[PDB]
Design an enzyme around this catalytic site. Structure first.
Site, PDB file in Angstrom:
ATOM      1  N   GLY A  18      -5.972   3.486   4.440  1.00 47.43           N
ATOM      2  CA  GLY A  18      -6.049   4.309   3.036  1.00 47.43           C
ATOM      3  C   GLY A  18      -7.263   3.816   1.978  1.00 47.43           C
ATOM      4  O   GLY A  18      -8.351   4.403   2.292  1.00 47.43           O
ATOM      5  N   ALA A  19      -7.107   3.004   0.877  1.00 50.12           N
ATOM      6  CA  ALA A  19      -7.823   3.245  -0.273  1.00 50.12           C
ATOM      7  C   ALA A  19      -8.821   1.984  -0.336  1.00 50.12           C
ATOM      8  O   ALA A  19     -10.057   2.139   0.090  1.00 50.12           O
ATOM      9  CB  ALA A  19      -7.213   3.288  -1.567  1.00 50.12           C
ATOM     10  N   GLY A  64      -7.981  -0.908   1.434  1.00 55.25           N
ATOM     11  CA  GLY A  64      -7.744  -1.739   2.457  1.00 55.25           C
ATOM     12  C   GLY A  64      -7.207  -0.907   3.867  1.00 55.25           C
ATOM     13  O   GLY A  64      -6.441  -0.156   3.579  1.00 55.25           O
ATOM     14  N   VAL A 121      -4.588  -2.004   6.594  1.00 60.61           N
ATOM     15  CA  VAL A 121      -3.518  -2.757   7.096  1.00 60.61           C
ATOM     16  C   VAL A 121      -3.244  -2.676   8.387  1.00 60.61           C
ATOM     17  O   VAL A 121      -3.006  -1.911   9.155  1.00 60.61           O
ATOM     18  CB  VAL A 121      -2.308  -2.353   6.084  1.00 60.61           C
ATOM     19  CG1 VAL A 121      -1.481  -3.725   6.116  1.00 60.61           C
ATOM     20  CG2 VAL A 121      -2.609  -2.210   4.328  1.00 60.61           C
ATOM     21  N   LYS A 180      -4.061  -7.121   5.147  1.00 62.43           N
ATOM     22  CA  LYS A 180      -4.789  -6.168   4.468  1.00 62.43           C
ATOM     23  C   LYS A 180      -6.023  -6.621   4.263  1.00 62.43           C
ATOM     24  O   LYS A 180      -6.406  -7.690   3.735  1.00 62.43           O
ATOM     25  CB  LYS A 180      -4.081  -5.717   3.300  1.00 62.43           C
ATOM     26  CG  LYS A 180      -5.087  -4.506   2.592  1.00 62.43           C
ATOM     27  CD  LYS A 180      -4.488  -4.270   1.094  1.00 62.43           C
ATOM     28  CE  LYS A 180      -4.417  -2.617   0.839  1.00 62.43           C
ATOM     29  NZ  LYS A 180      -3.505  -2.645  -0.408  1.00 62.43           N
ATOM     30  N   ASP A 232       1.010   3.704 -12.817  1.00 64.45           N
ATOM     31  CA  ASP A 232       0.866   4.603 -11.619  1.00 64.45           C
ATOM     32  C   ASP A 232       1.859   4.212 -10.482  1.00 64.45           C
ATOM     33  O   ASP A 232       1.416   4.152  -9.289  1.00 64.45           O
ATOM     34  CB  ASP A 232      -0.699   4.237 -11.373  1.00 64.45           C
ATOM     35  CG  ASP A 232      -1.083   5.377 -10.217  1.00 64.45           C
ATOM     36  OD1 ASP A 232      -0.569   6.328  -9.880  1.00 64.45           O
ATOM     37  OD2 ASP A 232      -2.181   5.158  -9.470  1.00 64.45           O
TER      38      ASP A 232
HETATM   39  O1  LIG Z   1       5.156   3.199   9.031  1.00 68.17           O
HETATM   40  C1  LIG Z   1       5.583   1.914   8.356  1.00 68.17           C
HETATM   41  C2  LIG Z   1       5.246   1.771   7.101  1.00 68.17           C
HETATM   42  C3  LIG Z   1       5.582   0.499   6.435  1.00 68.17           C
HETATM   43  C4  LIG Z   1       4.713  -0.709   7.201  1.00 68.17           C
HETATM   44  N1  LIG Z   1       5.349  -2.127   6.653  1.00 68.17           N
HETATM   45  C5  LIG Z   1       4.294  -2.565   5.712  1.00 68.17           C
HETATM   46  N2  LIG Z   1       4.645  -4.061   5.484  1.00 68.17           N
HETATM   47  C6  LIG Z   1       3.978  -4.653   4.381  1.00 68.17           C
HETATM   48  C7  LIG Z   1       2.961  -4.125   3.837  1.00 68.17           C
HETATM   49  N3  LIG Z   1       1.895  -4.596   3.044  1.00 68.17           N
HETATM   50  C8  LIG Z   1       1.189  -3.476   2.880  1.00 68.17           C
HETATM   51  N4  LIG Z   1       0.049  -3.421   2.132  1.00 68.17           N
HETATM   52  C9  LIG Z   1      -0.400  -4.605   1.420  1.00 68.17           C
HETATM   53  C10 LIG Z   1      -0.699  -5.713   2.189  1.00 68.17           C
HETATM   54  F1  LIG Z   1      -0.651  -5.993   3.598  1.00 68.17           F
HETATM   55  C11 LIG Z   1      -1.082  -7.006   1.540  1.00 68.17           C
HETATM   56  C12 LIG Z   1      -1.299  -7.000   0.280  1.00 68.17           C
HETATM   57  F2  LIG Z   1      -1.876  -7.989  -0.311  1.00 68.17           F
HETATM   58  C13 LIG Z   1      -1.045  -5.639  -0.466  1.00 68.17           C
HETATM   59  C14 LIG Z   1      -0.791  -4.508   0.136  1.00 68.17           C
HETATM   60  F3  LIG Z   1      -0.400  -3.457  -0.642  1.00 68.17           F
HETATM   61  N5  LIG Z   1       1.459  -2.502   3.696  1.00 68.17           N
HETATM   62  C15 LIG Z   1       0.516  -1.110   3.739  1.00 68.17           C
HETATM   63  C16 LIG Z   1       1.033  -0.381   5.116  1.00 68.17           C
HETATM   64  C17 LIG Z   1       1.314   1.015   4.580  1.00 68.17           C
HETATM   65  O2  LIG Z   1       2.232   0.810   3.417  1.00 68.17           O
HETATM   66  C18 LIG Z   1       1.362  -0.121   2.790  1.00 68.17           C
HETATM   67  C19 LIG Z   1       2.508  -2.865   4.304  1.00 68.17           C
HETATM   68  N6  LIG Z   1       3.298  -2.031   5.188  1.00 68.17           N
HETATM   69  C20 LIG Z   1       5.083  -0.875   8.714  1.00 68.17           C
HETATM   70  C21 LIG Z   1       4.962   0.686   9.295  1.00 68.17           C
END
Ligand SMILES: O[C@H]1CC[C@H](Nc2ncc3nc(Nc4c(F)cc(F)cc4F)n([C@H]4CCOC4)c3n2)CC1
EC number: 2.7.11.24
Length: 341
Positions: free
Chosen positions: A28-29, A31, A33, A48, A144
């Site tokens: 995405g933006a 980072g 993940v 991330k 947002d």
């Molecule tokens: O198809 C399914 C979609 C959900 C996914 N599960 C999941 N679980 C925890 C997550 N934490 C972040 N971002 C993040 C992080 F990692 C650390 C941070 F400090 C801040 C964050 F924003 N993401 C991202 C992935 C996509 O949506 C946001 C996460 N996705 C499993 C697969």
């Protein structure tokens, strides 16, 4: 070395040895993940990677503020960090921040695509409201709030991932505007109920299975809004700065459509007397939350006592204790200092 290097598709993950079996789950933006097994904690985690977040004022300001807020706030509906690291060892070598949190099952986009019973739909919303309550309780008005940045567990539990608005970027990825309040779209003043608007675009979307107020930028999008809700009332525009005011007072008029037209009986689990009462309850909140004029829009605390949401109420979850410009050089130092401490 404490660290090892994997090719997560295109980029390189260079993580602590504890994180095994990386799999790409969010590009995405700021980072990339990955999901991982954490052999020290013996659970799965989300990891991330901030690639060079000092690269510009945008990436940087978000990175740093989110780093800063992400360590001060303590609520289960708001992202908690389990770990942060850079594999580079000096400020001069410094490049990448890695952010580690509990692994979740799905984001809210995916959940929106599903039929939810009232109990789940409402339990989600109760939780979005608790987390915003929390953010507000500390001075953070998100502004947002969107479903691509909210996560859920199979047991219906929820976290908001990000901390909102403080903005140019050479990029492929567009910013998502659809859940933004009229105050943000029209550059107005604003208060804590600006986030309620966002929640109602979400709620509405869960019911409608379509984005309520889509569009190319703020022109299409203000249109999509008035032609559903109506042109706003005189003393709403009375609060619009002369130039924005000119533009709005001069757009085509609409009486707008009623809430049972906007959200028809078709869309609601409404088979039993239970889901009939809950359906009329949902629409009643929807219509208190999809309200252009912030002055007439329901508050966070009032929404928390709506009968649709009230059944989940809990003080420990609701009344939980609360907690400039720079060059690329200066942000690097700022960010590297928070990472280290
Ligand atoms: O198809 C399914 C979609 C959900 C996914 N599960 C999941 N679980 C925890 C997550 N934490 C972040 N971002 C993040 C992080 F990692 C650390 C941070 F400090 C801040 C964050 F924003 N993401 C991202 C992935 C996509 O949506 C946001 C996460 N996705 C499993 C697969």
């Amino acid at each position: 070395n404490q660290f090892y290097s994997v090719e997560v598709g295109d980029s390189t993950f260079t993580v602590l040895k504890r994180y095994q079996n990386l799999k790409p789950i969010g590009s995405g933006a700021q980072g990339i993940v990955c999901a991982a097994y954490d052999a020290v904690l013996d659970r799965n985690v989300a990891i991330k990677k901030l690639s060079r977040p000092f690269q510009n004022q945008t990436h940087a300001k978000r990175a740093y503020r989110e780093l800063v807020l992400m360590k001060c706030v303590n609520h289960k509906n708001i992202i908690s960090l389990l770990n942060v690291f850079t594999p580079q060892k000096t400020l001069e070598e410094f490049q990448d921040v890695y952010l580690v949190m509990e692994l979740m099952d799905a984001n809210l986009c995916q959940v929106i695509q599903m039929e939810l019973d009232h109990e789940r739909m409402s339990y989600l919303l109760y939780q979005m409201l608790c987390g915003i309550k929390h953010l507000h309780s500390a001075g953070i008005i998100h502004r947002d709030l969107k479903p691509s940045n909210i996560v859920v567990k199979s047991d219906c539990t929820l976290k908001i991932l990000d901390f909102g608005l403080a903005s140019f970027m050479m990029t492929p990825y567009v910013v998502t505007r659809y859940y933004r309040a009229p105050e943000v779209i029209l550059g107005m003043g604003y208060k804590e109920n600006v986030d309620i608007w966002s929640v109602g675009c979400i709620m509405g979307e869960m019911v409608r299975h379509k984005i309520l107020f889509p569009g190319r930028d703020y022109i299409d999008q203000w249109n999509k809004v008035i032609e559903q809700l109506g042109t706003p009332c005189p003393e709403f525009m009375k609060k619009l700065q002369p130039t924005v005011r000119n533009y709005v007072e001069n757009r085509p008029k609409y009486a707008g459509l009623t809430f049972p037209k906007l959200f028809p009986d078709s869309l609601f689990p409404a088979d039993s007397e239970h889901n009939k009462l809950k359906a009329s309850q949902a629409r009643d909140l929807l219509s208190k939350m999809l309200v252009i004029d912030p002055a007439k829009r329901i508050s966070v605390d009032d929404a928390l006592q709506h009968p649709y949401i009230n059944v989940w109420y809990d003080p420990a979850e609701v009344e939980a204790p609360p907690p400039r410009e720079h060059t690329i050089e200066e942000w690097k130092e700022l960010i590297y200092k928070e990472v280290m401490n």
